[PDB]
């Protein structure tokens, strides 16, 4: 696209060859990594990459010199498919100049492009080139750099990597203060341990202060003052990609309920002629002289994604007593649901590897509570149905069905296709889509009946879905956003949930076994400052302090966030940090992270 042409046109990906040589720091050897040396029939030796045959750069090495490199015994022409972990680790410590290494993360695998990325980044801030990485949120950027920091520090308890989560409301003064304190602790770490400090700006593309970050690394200056060259300090910046939504979701978004408060041509938040409302990542334009310095990682090509979601699920099932085999059932049903999200021209916001651990958190909530929920479901289905829905339910597979019921099935509009595409992975009690639909229908009926009774109510599928989702995401402190028409029974759900979700003064027994909720409302307006939003968060956190947080949850309910959409006061810009750690301009704590409707 003409407005995304300097950015979206990646002239190359990671999947194009990376022929590297390095001369080792403490050792006196060479590393030939990323390419192979083969013999030509003209008496010359050429560079050929693995995984295909490409004979790029004929006439590079003479064959008697190649024989000489046999004589002085360089580690030449080695593929890193058949090396064990200790040998790859000692090739890393010889190449990265690290003395006496350990293996800091045995779960983190070392394939050959992870070596090339680690050695590439280390070369870039060994010579002086700035390090800017343009990759998506799902790909392994923070894991690779934390492995690099833990490998470069070896064993010392000091603080080497500092990760700054840049959001849209990140002002320049915070970034300047954080670079100065990172510079102070960089001097302190070099003075005590002879060790250098990495400052990792994550998502360094969402703010208007990205040019400020250009001041930090492209010409090495902090608000007019220079950075000391012999201090020991490296700034790595990560950026979100630029792509426009495919047109059908922009159709379903302009028509979701009442439409946007502003139009698409008289809106103020642009990049070129494109609104930021219509982009997948809310990115501002990179300044030039960082465009020829940014380069791309991989994109998680869907083969190794199963491995990463398996490590995440085995680290968050806590399978000391769950199951041996149903963890694999969780893993491949989540892989199938992620592939269903990929087998469509869009996702919501490309939520890969963060929706999965949130959804495993939901599964853990259900499986911890799958003792009274199944008794109440047995009671309800016996008093209100036949013996068809009166079978014994597995307390692990039912929780998985409801996990994908609230993670993926609730937001989608093509729900029946999702159910018939996800039922090919489940075992015997959920082989059909009808069984999953019946199960979520009966448990939504169970939570609507656990509420106090109402007559002349619009008892429909929308009210049941909204009550069910709101009860769960208030229990788990997941934010939920609800757009509908002005008669969608979406504020009636707020009333009946806020009256039913009392802790010990509840009506039924299911809600008596859950948390107490006191909510502070704030009706947004086009004339809304962000200070009111910060005051509402601090007020509900003031309600939440001093109490048992397993039986008390505060939740902010913002009532007209559609009216605060493109207001020039920009009140929702502060919303993105306040939903993550619960407070801006303060260190996180308990009684600060609050629920959000």
């Amino acid at each position: 696209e003409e407005d995304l042409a300097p950015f979206s046109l990646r002239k190359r990906w990671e999947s194009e060859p990376h022929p590297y040589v390095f001369f080792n720091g403490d050792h006196m050897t060479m590393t030939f990594i990323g390419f192979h040396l083969e013999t030509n029939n003209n008496g010359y030796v050429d560079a050929i990459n693995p995984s295909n045959g490409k004979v790029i750069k004929k006439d590079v090495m003479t064959k008697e010199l190649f024989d000489g490199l046999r004589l002085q015994r360089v580690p030449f022409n080695i593929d890193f498919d058949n090396l064990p972990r200790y040998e790859k680790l000692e090739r890393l410590c010889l190449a990265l100049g690290i003395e006496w290494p350990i293996d800091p993360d045995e779960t983190y695998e070392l394939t050959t492009d992870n070596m090339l990325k680690i050695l590439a980044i280390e070369m870039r801030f060994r010579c002086g080139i700035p390090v800017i990485i343009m990759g998506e949120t799902g790909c392994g950027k923070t894991r690779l750099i934390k492995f690099l920091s833990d490998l470069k520090r070896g064993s010392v308890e000091a603080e080497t990597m500092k990760l700054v989560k840049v959001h849209g409301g990140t002002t320049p003064s915070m970034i300047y203060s954080k670079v100065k304190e990172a510079e102070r602790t960089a001097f302190s770490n070099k003075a005590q341990h002879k060790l250098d400090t990495i400052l990792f700006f994550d998502e360094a593309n969402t703010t208007e202060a990205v040019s400020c970050i250009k001041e930090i690394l492209c010409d090495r200056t902090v608000d007019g003052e220079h950075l000391h060259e012999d201090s020991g300090l490296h700034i790595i910046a990560a950026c979100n990609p630029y792509r426009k939504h495919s047109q059908e979701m922009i159709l379903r978004l302009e028509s979701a309920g009442l439409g946007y408060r502003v139009s698409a041509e008289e809106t103020a938040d642009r990049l070129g002629s494109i609104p930021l409302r219509q982009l997948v990542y809310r990115v501002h334009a990179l300044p030039p002289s960082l465009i020829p310095l940014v380069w791309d990682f991989g994109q998680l090509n869907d083969s190794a994604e199963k491995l990463y979601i398996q490590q995440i699920v085995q680290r968050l099932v806590d399978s000391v007593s769950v199951n041996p085999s149903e963890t694999c059932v969780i893993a491949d049903v989540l892989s199938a649901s992620q592939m269903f999200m990929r087998k469509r021209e869009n996702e919501c916001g490309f939520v890969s590897l963060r929706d999965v651990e949130r959804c495993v958190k939901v599964f853990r909530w259900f499986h911890d509570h799958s003792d009274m929920l199944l008794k109440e479901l047995d009671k309800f289905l016996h008093e209100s149905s036949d013996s068809t829905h009166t079978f014994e339910r597995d307390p692990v597979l039912w929780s998985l069905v409801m996990a994908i019921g609230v993670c993926y099935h609730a937001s989608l509009e093509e729900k029946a296709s999702y159910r018939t595409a996800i039922a090919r992975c489940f075992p015997k009690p959920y082989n059909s889509s009808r069984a999953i639909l019946d199960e979520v229908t009966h448990v939504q009926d169970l939570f609507l009946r656990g509420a106090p009774i109402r007559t002349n109510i619009a008892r429909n599928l929308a009210l049941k879905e909204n009550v069910f989702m709101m009860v769960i995401c208030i229990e788990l402190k997941i934010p939920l956003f609800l757009v509908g028409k002005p008669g969608s029974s979406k504020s009636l759900a707020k009333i009946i949930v806020a009256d039913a979700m009392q802790g010990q003064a509840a009506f039924s027994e299911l809600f008596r076994c859950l948390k107490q909720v006191h909510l502070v409302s704030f009706q947004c307006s086009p004339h809304s400052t962000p200070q009111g939003i910060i005051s509402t968060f601090k007020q509900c956190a003031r309600f939440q302090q001093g109490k048992d947080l397993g039986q008390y949850v505060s939740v902010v309910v913002l009532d007209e966030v559609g009216l605060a959409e493109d207001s020039p006061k920009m009140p929702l810009k502060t919303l993105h940090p306040l939903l993550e750690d619960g407070c801006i301009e303060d260190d996180p704590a308990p009684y600060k992270k609050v629920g959000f409707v």
Binding site: E208, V210, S211, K214, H284, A285, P287, P288
Partner: protein
Amino acid sequence: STSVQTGIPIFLFKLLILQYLMDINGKIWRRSPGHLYLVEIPQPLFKFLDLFPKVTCRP
């Protein structure tokens, strides 16, 4: 910088030609003959920047 979209010629007219910057609840700034102000602006505006003594830089 490049992300300073909608403020440039008013500021250049105040500081470089009208020689002032004023706060109505406070102090007033006067440009003085005796200091040099270089204003690094990358590249409508292309004609307004021509009014000034200009040092252009090329690849």
